[PDB]
Amino acid sequence: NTPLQAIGVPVALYDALMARAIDSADGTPNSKWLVTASRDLDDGQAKEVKEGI
């Protein structure tokens, strides 16, 4: 007759949630500003637009 009898479900749930958090911490790109040009920009200055931003 021990408390560990009735805490399996929540401790497993906690482990799963914390594993999800750890994983998503490293793996979701931390970048913003997804910029996009069009197929008419002479890459040779699209380098220049990037260096500008």
Binding site: R39, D40, D42, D43, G44, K47, E51
Partner: protein, 180 residues
């Protein structure tokens, strides 16, 4: 010289102007010069054996980042001097990328494509198209081709009336230009 790369007979055969000329030959030479100087600076790939470059660089990207104007060569070492270096540093670049990782700081190298049989087939095909487009478009017809939907507020006819865009050219030699 281009006649080694692309002879006028292949032009006159592709644009279906073998039988009917539709242009004299010197005009065709000028069109070909334009078409080889358009794809060249559109994709960023040179055609002459080299051009030894000397360039002043500025360090940015606290990790330490060097952006070059040309695209190294492919396999040589690039050397940095001045800047405060006791001796010329020597790095080896990544093939096809002008990104390096380290009282002014210069850098010298050579830009590549020293052969002739390396323009694989693509840039040739697109150039044929762009020539073909210029052969019959002296700039008399309007021929403006639509880009994004919303008709401009000013109420004009639209945009992108551009040889080597509204012809095949871009979609043809784009399979080479990188996306980043």
């Amino acid at each position: 010289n281009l006649d080694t790369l692309l002879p006028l007979q292949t032009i006159r055969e592709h644009a279906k102007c073998d039988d009917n000329p539709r242009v004299t030959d010197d005009l065709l030479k000028l069109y070909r010069e334009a078409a080889f100087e358009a794809a060249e600076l559109y994709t960023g790939l040179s055609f002459t054996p080299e051009k030894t470059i000397v360039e002043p660089i500025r360090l940015k990207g606290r990790r330490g980042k060097i952006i070059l104007s040309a695209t190294p060569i492919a396999g040589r070492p690039v050397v940095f001097y001045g800047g405060g270096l006791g001796s010329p540093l020597e790095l080896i670049p990544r093939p096809g990328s002008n990104v390096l990782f380290f009282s002014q700081l210069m850098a010298t190298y050579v830009t590549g494509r020293r052969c002739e049989n390396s323009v694989p087939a693509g840039i040739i095909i697109g150039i044929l198209k762009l020539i073909a487009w210029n052969i019959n478009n002296p700039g008399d017809e309007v021929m403006s081709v639509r880009n994004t939907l919303n008709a401009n507020a000013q109420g004009l006819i639209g945009g992108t009336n551009n040889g080597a865009v509204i012809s095949g050219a871009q979609d043809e030699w784009f399979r080479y230009r990188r996306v980043l």
